[PDB]
Amino acid sequence: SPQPLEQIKLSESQLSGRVGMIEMDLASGRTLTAWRADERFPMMSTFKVVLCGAVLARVDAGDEQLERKIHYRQQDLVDYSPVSEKHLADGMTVGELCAAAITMSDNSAANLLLATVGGPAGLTAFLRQIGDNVTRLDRWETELNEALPGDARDTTTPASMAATLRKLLTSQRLSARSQRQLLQWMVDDRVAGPLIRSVLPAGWFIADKTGAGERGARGIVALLGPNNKAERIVVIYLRDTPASMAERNQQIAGIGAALIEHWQR
């Protein structure tokens, strides 16, 4: 593979789209690679990690319990509810809803959670309270994936998302148990996680949340590192490309390959 930055450029060229990328040391926040890191990209399903960070903050404050069972109706369901559609009779705990949102990309679980934190406005208010002055949620699942060109709704920037993930996972804004829980939900992704392991060299740690959207939008927020350690946060977003899903996936994999072969920067 080429150097990370050269590979990122090759991905824009091949996709005819914008790539946004940051690579950041998880422990310290050192930025290693930044490309279009202050430009806006739709978060898509990546927003669910932030969502659950706001949930956990409420649990830490005594305002929520991960045990609390939420009951909902079939009319509450939106497109793609692989776990939540199975619990119309018995409900799901808040903790279970976060597992379903992060690990299975369950959209009704995400909207149920979003209601608990005050909706898109409430989650944006939470972001402002942790010092993220850029990322915004405006809409609910699945409209938030619309990715209209030039539309600021439901966007983050790579730099802002990396800083916010770092804050949620490590800054002691969340309690120790909550930081640990957020991490474990990312480790437990049921879809992209296992496939990524299957192509990662031995000894590479992965935790992640992926997302997709219209007009080629695609992204991943991940923790990655050798020696079975979550050394770096890697955030990669794509937008405004007509390419197939397989090609957007291959390009993202390509950027990862470049990071792996050129790790010690």
Ligand X SMILES: *C(=O)c1cc2ccccn2c1N[C@@H](C(=O)O)[C@](C)(COC(=O)NCCN)S(=O)O
Ligand Y SMILES: OC[C@H]1O[C@H](O[C@H]2[C@H](O)[C@@H](O)[C@H](OCCCCCCC3CCCCC3)O[C@@H]2CO)[C@H](O)[C@@H](O)[C@@H]1O
What's the closest the beta carbon of residue 235 comes to ligand Y, in angstroms?
Answer: 8
Query: For ligand Y, what does the binding mask look like between residues 225 and 254, x meaning CB under 6 A?
Result: ---------x-x---------------xx-
> Is residue 224 within the footprint of ligand Y (CB under 6 A)?
yes
Interface of this chain with ligand X, residues 32 to 71, rule: CB under 6 A = 44-45
SS3 for 84?
helix
Residue pair 134/158 in contact (Cβ under 8 Å)? The answer is no
Q: Please tell me the distance from the alpha carbon of residue 200 to that of residue 53, in angstroms, as a whole number.
A: 27
Q: How far is the CB of 179 from ligand X (least distance, A)?
A: 22
- Total of chain residues touching ligand X, rule CB under 6 A: 11
On whether 105 is known to bind a ligand per the annotation, the reply is yes
How many chain residues touch ligand Y (CB under 6 A)?
A: 17
Contacts of 233 (CB under 8 A, 6+ apart): 22, 23, 24, 25, 26, 162, 165, 166, 221, 222, 223
Provide the minimum distance between the beta carbon of 202 and ligand Y in the complex, in angstroms, as a whole number: 7
Local structure of residue 28 (DSSP, 8 states): T
Please, are residues 186 and 168 in contact by the beta-carbon 8 Å criterion?
Answer: no
**CB nearer ligand Y, residue 140 or residue 263:** 263
Among 4, 95, 158, 211, binds ligand X (CB under 6 A): 211
Stretch of 33-41, 83-91, 174-182, 211-219 lying at the interface with ligand X (CB under 6 A): 211-219
What percentage of the chain's residues is helix, strand, coil (to nearest 5)? 45, 15, 35
The binding site for ligand X (CB under 6 A) comprises: 44-45, 105, 145, 191-192, 210-213, 245
